[PDB]
Structure formats: structure tokens, C-alpha cells
Amino acid sequence: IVGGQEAPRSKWPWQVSLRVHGPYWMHFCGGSLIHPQWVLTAAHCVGPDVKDLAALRVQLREQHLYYQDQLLPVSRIIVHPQFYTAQIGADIALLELEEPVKVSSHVHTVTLPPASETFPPGMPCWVTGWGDVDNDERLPPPFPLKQVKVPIMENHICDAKYHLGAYTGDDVRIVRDDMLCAGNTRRDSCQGDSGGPLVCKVNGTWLQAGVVSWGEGCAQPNRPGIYTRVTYYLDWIHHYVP
Amino acid sequence: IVGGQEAPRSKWPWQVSLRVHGPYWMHFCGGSLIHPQWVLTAAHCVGPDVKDLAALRVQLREQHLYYQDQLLPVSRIIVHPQFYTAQIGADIALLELEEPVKVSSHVHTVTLPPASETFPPGMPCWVTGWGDVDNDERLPPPFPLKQVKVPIMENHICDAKYHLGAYTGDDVRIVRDDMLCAGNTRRDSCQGDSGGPLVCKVNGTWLQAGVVSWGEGCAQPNRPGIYTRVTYYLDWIHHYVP
Amino acid sequence: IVGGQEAPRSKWPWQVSLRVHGPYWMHFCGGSLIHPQWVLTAAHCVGPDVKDLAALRVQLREQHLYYQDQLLPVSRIIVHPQFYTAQIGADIALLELEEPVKVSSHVHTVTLPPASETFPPGMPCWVTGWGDVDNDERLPPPFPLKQVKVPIMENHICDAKYHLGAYTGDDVRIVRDDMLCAGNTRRDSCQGDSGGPLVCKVNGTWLQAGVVSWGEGCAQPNRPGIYTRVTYYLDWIHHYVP
Amino acid sequence: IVGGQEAPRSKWPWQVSLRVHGPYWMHFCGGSLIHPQWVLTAAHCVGPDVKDLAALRVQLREQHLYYQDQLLPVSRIIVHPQFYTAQIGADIALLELEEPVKVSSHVHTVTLPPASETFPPGMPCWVTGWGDVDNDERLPPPFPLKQVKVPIMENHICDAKYHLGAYTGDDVRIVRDDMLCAGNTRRDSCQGDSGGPLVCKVNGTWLQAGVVSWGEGCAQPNRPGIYTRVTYYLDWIHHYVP
Ligand SMILES: NCc1ccc2c(c1)C1(CCN(C(=O)c3ccc(C#Cc4ccccc4)o3)CC1)CO2
Ligand SMILES: NCc1ccc2c(c1)C1(CCN(C(=O)c3ccc(C#Cc4ccccc4)o3)CC1)CO2
Ligand SMILES: NCc1ccc2c(c1)C1(CCN(C(=O)c3ccc(C#Cc4ccccc4)o3)CC1)CO2
Ligand SMILES: NCc1ccc2c(c1)C1(CCN(C(=O)c3ccc(C#Cc4ccccc4)o3)CC1)CO2
């Protein structure tokens, strides 16, 4: 997370951390609890190569990374079959926890958007995670969860930003319909936030609009953060999650 | 280059090395002289972001990198308009030298293939360059140009291989029609070889079948090297090059 | 710390962590509380070059580095004037805290040895710290304080051990009388443990025998850990600490 | 070498490169040819730990490292017995080549100084090598041999300077009688120059005044390069070298 600050303990109870086995269970991506037994994340976090589930754990909302881990095992990893790169799209996956979580006040699900929802350019959206605080700058110990408000930028506008200072034909679409742009030169997600939630408040309800997916660097000029657009994948999600 | 060996001084007169301005003029990509004033390379070597022409130089065939440099300024960089990631394709670019080179017998052009050439398996093909000699393993000083003979694999055969050990649906095509596959677990191209020539001997003449483009690591199981297919882009090449 | 295990929360209440200002207040050396207002540590942690007082802080006994820091400013760094390299000796220094520590049962001073105590082999001694868990191997988050029981040996055997497999003349003293040696191929202090305490239980009282100083690698054959022999410097210490 | 300039191809015919076996025969220290069968270098380059002869090669003077290698095996490594740390001193060693070298125009021995020569300030002196060109900055390909003219500083003056901005007591001698000091903030040897020659033009002959030994960083204020004083060890050298 670039800009923004430490998240208050009461906020973002759906934020999760994905751990990879090694000399310790190291954070490598974010995710959200969308159901007591399912976590939504980015496909590029766990794919396209198939890995061993024994080497993966999930950690539920935690104020500081590593401090009081209660790692949860995963029984299934479901990666969108269209996925193989973030730029091509379909950057979305589901992890089934071995057991339902006993859901509470500091840990509970985020609500997915209705099939209609648009999230117009200039709305209140927040992205959260334990990722880098700038290009090539790790979040320092004790690794607090970070939050930052980012402005939505509608797709065509965002796609045109991405053509500025690049060779790509203006007719070539870079920002796809299954994606969504947010952020600017001061507020953005970064490496290690991948797979985590972009949420927006609408009618007093937090809806997860996006999954942190990709972009060119973090908070670079004319390169807003790119998210997988959740509404686009609702039908696929509900094929697995109650 | 993975596997293979140091090239003889006579061979591959069209091989060039791309240099970026820094603490020294460092090699970053390969290329081939296809016309006394034009170099064929990979788009991902120079794009998709537009960079400064003054930060770039071309070195013509040289047995050891850096030893007897004679760097050539470039007057313009032409990247295929469809390009923005190597996986999406159109990974091909052209460099116009400020001046034609005084063609030699140590330096001269490679022949482009006729549009009809398919380069089927069994064809004798070589890739060359000064890239890494294995994953994360640098070519050591004095940086001899290396060469390696790689077996060609049909696109659809290569496509299936990239689905082994991957989540990606069988209906999702990874190896595209503008691509070509070559190499195995002992012979392949690598980081630093990008942009360089895959050439095959056809009825006595060496034709450039491909441009080193991408792949999953180097010489990994079920992950043949992927090249931009030169035939596919002949019309685009011919629009610029005499 | 190499070998051994996480310290129980009630143990080693005199252990401290020295922090250097940066992107965060990063642990760089250990120390020990020897008086409510004085920390004992290694000279090579703070010298031979004089650094800015304002770039240093002291952290008292924590289970886990960084998580609930209460950083303390220092008013004086006093380095033994004989010191310039650990290999030569006098590797000892004192930090005066701006204000006295209000001691409890989780934070309090360690007792210094009488001048007469030689800490012969067979004595039960532990070294504690947040240092590397092996050669070139960082302590993993969440950075628990570690402890290891290490065998004390005599100076003459430690000196001779260091000549083993080395060119140095047998008549050249490497391990000097102001040093003390402990550890083996399985139990040792390491980088990041420097300046921290080696303590032994004598007559049911814990006495600080040494200050982590140097050695060749950690837990290497014939290279035991070398500590500054605290008894050697009692007079100097007592010029400053009441 | 911090800085100076590339050496002219006719200069310093006695300079040698020491190479350690690995992925390639990598330069790690310099040395000088003082006899057709003996190389003079620094002790810390080959000790104090005894290493295997098979892992070492000597390369005679090359204009550019690695390009025309003709590696020479060593049959004896002789390390001064007083040595264990560069800062304590006796940082001098001898390599006996397996076979004598056939002296050329481009390769010949450097003359040792008469015991009487003190090398006062104001003498024309050069240090040479393929070491770093600044703190943590490698010599770039093609690795030209560098030379820099360095100002000699008297021992007592240099010793005093090493106390500037340090805690070390004034009556503690840092720069010893078997050392010599040279360089300033624009001119110094550096990592990788270790073991190489400091030479001075005296009465029409180049004499080797010093062997590159140590210093606090390279070209830092009040921290001139420290060399092993050759005259101090003439007896020891002549015990081995005809
Ligand atoms: N901040 C969100 C954001 C969030 C998480 C995250 C990134 C960006 C990464 C994504 C990949 N990455 C890259 O930098 C990258 C990979 C591919 C491209 C591109 C492009 C491009 C295409 C057309 C025109 C211009 C540029 O940029 C580093 C930043 C690392 O993980
Ligand atoms: N050796 C040719 C080859 C030649 C040059 C070169 C590479 C490979 C790179 C390409 C990018 N890279 C990768 O590692 C990479 C980037 C994207 C993927 C992938 C994939 C995949 C897609 C679908 C199914 C399975 C895997 O792998 C390192 C090796 C670096 O430069
Ligand atoms: N484990 C305690 C221990 C505790 C902390 C610590 C070390 C060792 C270091 C000390 C320096 N270092 C070295 O490795 C080193 C520096 C100097 C020498 C030497 C020597 C020698 C002298 C005579 C004969 C043979 C060798 O070895 C890495 C391990 C790093 O910090
Ligand atoms: N440029 C010659 C020079 C030539 C070669 C070379 C160095 C210096 C090194 C020596 C070691 N090193 C250090 O930096 C170092 C090791 C020990 C000390 C010290 C000290 C000191 C003692 C008393 C008072 C003040 C400082 O500094 C980096 C530069 C590495 O290789």
C-alpha cells in the first residue's frame, strides 16, 4: 500500500494473508473472506502453475503480520480456467478452507457487489494489505495492515492513460472489461497487496469491487492500479461459493 | 544460452547486442542484422514504454562482449503497435541505425524466410546469444557468444505441454499462431538472449525462423522456449525495411 | 543464536536490543541492563567511529522484536579507549540512558561477576539474542528472543583451536586474556547477537560472564564463539557505573 | 582503484591477478611478480585459513581481465606466521609458481626496495589493480587494469588521522611500523586491489614500497589506504625468494 496509513483494529475484518511454506510461513499475497469457508484472491497469486496445497496456509485478519498466527489449511484451490496472465485477464481464484471459520466481529465476510454495480469514477473506495509501501520498498516490521483511499477511474479513461508514453496502438485495448482502475500518483496498491480487496461503500454497505491484480509499478504517472472486476466473475464465483 | 557452446568466430555474422547506457554500456538483449541499416529485435526489449534513443546503442557481431566495442547510435525505434506483453504477442520490433554498416564477411545480414515456410519439427535450428546459461545463472566473463541447436516443436504440441502442471483450461490457447516453439530441458534460450535470432538451415540458406521472446524459465520440463514467428510479421517488416 | 530455542517470557529480563534509525528502528546489536541507567554492550556495535547519539535507541526486554516497542534515548556512549577492532580486544562499551529504568520482574539488571570468578569449563551458561540463526541466515519473523546453552572452554584451548587449520604461528596469541570462549558446532552466538550477554548461574546467582564479540562464522569446526571477558573490565566499568 | 585512469599497456609488467575456482576463474586479489617463480601478495588474500592449492590460479599481466587468460598453477602458498588480521599487521604472503615464468617485454619482475628507503611524502607513487572503483562499486567490463597516483603520508601523521572521529585512545597505535600510508579522498586502492603493488619511481627504478592491505572504506575522509611496508619484511621474503 502506497500512501494511506495503518488500519484501525476494527476495520477490514475480511482481510486475509496467504502464507507460503519456507524458513517461516511468509506472506506473499492478500485475499478476502467472502464466505466462512471461502477466500477470494488473485489467480496470479496461486497460478498458473499448480502447487502443493500442503505449502499454503491462510491467516485471517491480523493487525500485525506474523505476531499471533493461527494458520488455516486449504482443501481446494480453484483458479479461473481462462487465467494465465494478469494482463490477459481472468485474474481471480478461490481457496476453500478445510473448516468453516467461526465468524465474529473482528473477522467476518465482505459482501460481493450486485450483478449491476458500476462503481463510477470518483467514488469512496479503499484498498488494503501488507504489501510494499513504494516501488521496491518493503513494509517494515512490525508489519501493520495498511489502508488507502483510492479514486476510481473509468475504464476507457484508464486505458488511454496506459497508452500515454507507450508504443501500443490506440486501438489495442489494455484495460479489459473484466478489469477496473483505481489509484493515482500518491495512493495505490503494490507488490504483496495482490489478491486483496478493493472495497467501496455504497448505501452504507462495503462491497468488494475489485481484487488487486496488476499495473505498471506502483503510483507511477499515468499508470493507475488495475483490479480484477468482481461483478464480471459473480456467476463463476457463485458456482462454487454458497 | 542453456547447454550448447561458444560459437566459432566465422558463424552468426548477423548477431547483434543491444546496450543500455549506465555505469557502462551494458548488454540487455539480442538482435539480428536483417538489412545493412536495420536490426530485428523483440518488442519487449524496448517497449511497451517509449524510452530515450540516446540511452541505446547497437553492437555488431563480436566474439566477446565489451572487449572491442564499436557502438552504433540508433535513429529510430519501431515497435509493433499490437505489442504490450510477450504472452499476448506481437513481440517484435525494428531498429534503424543512424547509418548503414559497411557490410563485411564478419558482419552481414541474415535472410528472412519466405511467407510459406513453416519450419516443421526435425529442421536443424540454432539459437545464439550472450544470455544466462541457466535460470538465474549469468554468462561468465569473458562473455563468449554461445550457440545451441534446439529441436523445433509444432505449435499445438507445444501448447499441450504448457497446460501440463497448469490450471489453465484446455480450450485456452497459450502458444499463439504468431509464435513458434523450440528447445528442451537441455537446450534453450534464456534471459539476455531475448530479441536474438533462431535460425534454421533450409536448402543451404540460413533463414531467421524466430525472435527469442519468452517462456517459463529456461530449459524447464514441459516449457519449451517460445519465439516470435518471423513469417507472421513479414508484411509489417517489409513496410519499413527495403 | 544458533541452535537452542525461544526464550520463555520470564527469562533474561536484562536483555536489550540496540536500534539504529532508518526506514524503521532496526535491531543491530544486543546489550544488557547492568544498572537502571546503564547498558553494557560491545564496542564494535557503536565504534570505533563516533556516530550520532540521536540515531540510536535502546529497547528493553521484548519477547518479539518490533511488536510493542518502547524506544529509549541514550545520553552517553562510552567506548573503551583501547578498542578499535574486535580481534584485538577491549571490545566493550557502555550506554547511559537519558533516564533511569523503573525496574520490575520482567525488566531488571543482571549481576556482574566478582573479579575472582574464572568461569571454568562445566559451568552452566547461556547466550541470548535476536541474531542470525545460522551463517547468513536471519532470524525469521516474528523475531522471538532466543537462548542457547553453550559449553565454556579454557582460553588456551580456544586459542589453540583457532590455530588449527590456519597459517598463524603457534606462538602468536589470537585469543587474549580479556576474552572468554564458549560454544561448539551446534550451539553458538552469531551476527546480531553481538554485544549481548553470556550469563552463567553461580551459587544460584546469574552472573554476566561475557559480551558477544566475534569469532569466525558461527558454529564452525574449531572456531568457538569469542566473548569479551567481563571480569577483565570491572575497574573501567566501575569508573562510570555506580 | 578509486580515481586515476586505465594503465597504458606498457606499464606495470609485474602486476598479477589471483583467481579462485568457481563458475569461472574469478579475480579476488592482486599480486606482483618479484621473481620469475614467486608472486608477492597480501596474507589476508589467502589466509589466515589454509585453503586448497588446486582452487587457486595466478594470471600474469593482462590489459583486460579474463579476455586472454593463461592461468598458472601455484605449488606453494607461504603466509607470514605473525598474520591473522590485516589490522594487526604482517599482512604479507608469497606464492611459488609451479613453473618459472619466461620474462617478456610485457611481463617482468618488480624490484624490491633497499632497507634504507622510507618513501617520504612527495615521491611519485602509483597503486594498480582491477579492484572496485568506489565503495561497493565494481570495475565494469571489460575490466581494464587501473592505476592511480597516490600521495604518501608519514606513519605518525596517518596514525593520528585514524583517531579523528573515533573513540580510540591517542596512545593506541593503529598504523604500525610495518605499515605505510597512501591516498586521499580522490585516490585510493579498494576491495579487489588487496595484495597488489604500491610502486615508487626512485633513481630511475620502480621499487615496490607496499602491498595493498586495508583501510576504512576507500577514499574516505581521514582514512588513507594502509599498505604493508615491504622493507619491513625483506628478511622474511629473502628466506624464500632467491
Ligand atoms: N499498483 C498496482 C499493482 C499492484 C500489485 C502489483 C503491481 C501493480 C505489480 C504488477 C506487475 N509489475 C509491473 O510493473 C508490470 C507488469 C506488466 C506491466 C505493464 C505494462 C504496460 C502495458 C501497456 C502500456 C504501458 C505499460 O507492468 C510490478 C507492479 C506487482 O504486483
Ligand atoms: N527459455 C525461453 C526464454 C528466453 C528468454 C527469456 C525467458 C524465457 C524469460 C521469459 C519470462 N520469464 C518467465 O519465467 C515467465 C513469464 C511468464 C511465464 C509463464 C507461463 C505459463 C503460462 C501458462 C501455463 C504455464 C506457464 O514465465 C523468465 C524467463 C526471461 O527471458
Ligand atoms: N560466533 C561468534 C560470533 C558472534 C557474532 C558475530 C560473529 C561471530 C561474526 C564475527 C565476524 N565474522 C567472521 O567470520 C570473522 C571476522 C574475522 C574473523 C577471523 C579470524 C581468524 C583469526 C585467526 C585464525 C583463524 C581465523 O572471522 C562473521 C561472524 C559476525 O558477528
Ligand atoms: N583503501 C584501502 C583499502 C584497500 C582494499 C580494501 C579495503 C581498503 C577494505 C578494507 C576493509 N574494509 C573496511 O572498511 C574496514 C575493516 C576494518 C576497518 C577499520 C577501522 C578503523 C580503525 C581505527 C580507527 C578508525 C577506523 O575498516 C572495507 C575496505 C576492503 O579491501
Taking the Cβ of residue D88 and every Cβ of chain C, the question of whether any pair is shorter than 8 Å is answered with: yes
Beta-carbon neighbour count of residue B159 at 10 Å?
Answer: 18
Closest CA to C141 of A141, A63, A144, A1: A141
Burial of D160 (0-12, 13-18, 19+ CB in 10 A): middle
Taking the Cβ of residue D22 and every Cβ of chain C, the question of whether any pair is shorter than 8 Å is answered with: no
**Neighboring chains of A (3 or more beta-carbon pairs < 8 A):** B, C
Which residues, in sequence order, are CB contacts of B48 under 8 Å at separation 6+? A166, A167, A168, B79, B83, B84, B85
Taking the Cβ of residue D174 and every Cβ of chain C, the question of whether any pair is shorter than 8 Å is answered with: yes
Q: Whose CA is nearest to atom 19 of ligand 1?
A: A216
Beta-carbon neighbour count of residue D191 at 10 Å?
Answer: 17
Amino acid at the residue D2: V
Q: Which residue on chain C is closest to A27 by alpha carbon?
A: C141
Beta bridge partners of C226: C181, C214
Q: Whose CA is nearest to atom 17 of ligand 2?
A: B216
What is the least distance, in Å, from the CA of A87 to any CA of chain B? 8
Q: How do the domains of chain A map onto residue ranges?
A: 1-12+110-231, 13-109+232-242
Q: Do B88 and A84 touch (CB under 8 A)?
A: no
* Coarse DSSP helix, strand, coil percentages of chain D, rounded to the nearest 5 percent: 10, 35, 55
Experimental technique, in short, is X-ray
Q: Which three cell numbers stand for residue C191?
A: 551476527
Closest CA to D19 of C56, D51, D37, D4: D51
Relative to the CA of B87, which ligand 2 atom is closest?
17
Instruction: Kindly identify the ligand whose nearest atom is closest to the C-alpha of A216.
Output: 1
Q: Do D142 and B23 touch (CB under 8 A)?
A: no
Task: Please list every residue in chain C whose beta carbon sits closer than 8 Å to the beta carbon of residue A142.
Answer: 66-67, 69, 142
Minimum-distance CB partner of C81 among D47, D85, D169: D169
Beta bridge partners of B137: B134
Cβ–Cβ < 8 Å for B121, B154:
yes
Q: Which residue on chain B is closest to D23 by alpha carbon?
A: B140
Beta-carbon neighbour count of residue C63 at 10 Å?
Answer: 16
How many Å lie between the centroid of ligand 1 and the Cα of residue A217?
5
> Are domains A1-12+110-231 and A13-109+232-242 of this chain identical in fold?
yes
Q: Which three cell numbers stand for residue B150?
A: 534446439
The rounded distance, in Å, linking the Cα atoms of D123 and D200 is: 7
Task: Give the DSSP H or E segment for A19.
Answer: strand A15-20
Q: Which of C128, C181, C188, C216 to mutate to test the pocket of ligand 3 (most atoms within 8 A of CB)?
A: C216
Peptide bond connecting A48 to the previous residue in cis, omega within 30 degrees of 0? yes
Taking the Cβ of residue D165 and every Cβ of chain C, the question of whether any pair is shorter than 8 Å is answered with: yes
DSSP state of D122: T
The rounded distance, in Å, linking the Cα atoms of D38 and B33 is: 49
Cβ–Cβ < 8 Å for B32, B15:
yes
Q: Whose CA is nearest to atom 15 of ligand 3?
A: C216
CATH annotation of D1-12+110-231 = 2.40.10.10
The rounded distance, in Å, linking the Cα atoms of D151 and A154 is: 65
**Neighboring chains of D (3 or more beta-carbon pairs < 8 A):** B, C
B43-79 b/e (C-beta count within 10 Å ≥ 16 → b): bbbbbbeeeeeeebbbbbbbebbbbeeeebebeebbb
> How many interchain CB pairs under 8 A, A with C?
26
Q: SS3 of D202, please? A: strand
CATH number for domain D13-109+232-242, candidates 2.60.40.10, 2.40.10.10, 1.10.357.10, 3.40.50.410? 2.40.10.10
Resolution of the experimental model, in Å, one decimal: 2.3
Q: SS3 of C240, please? A: helix
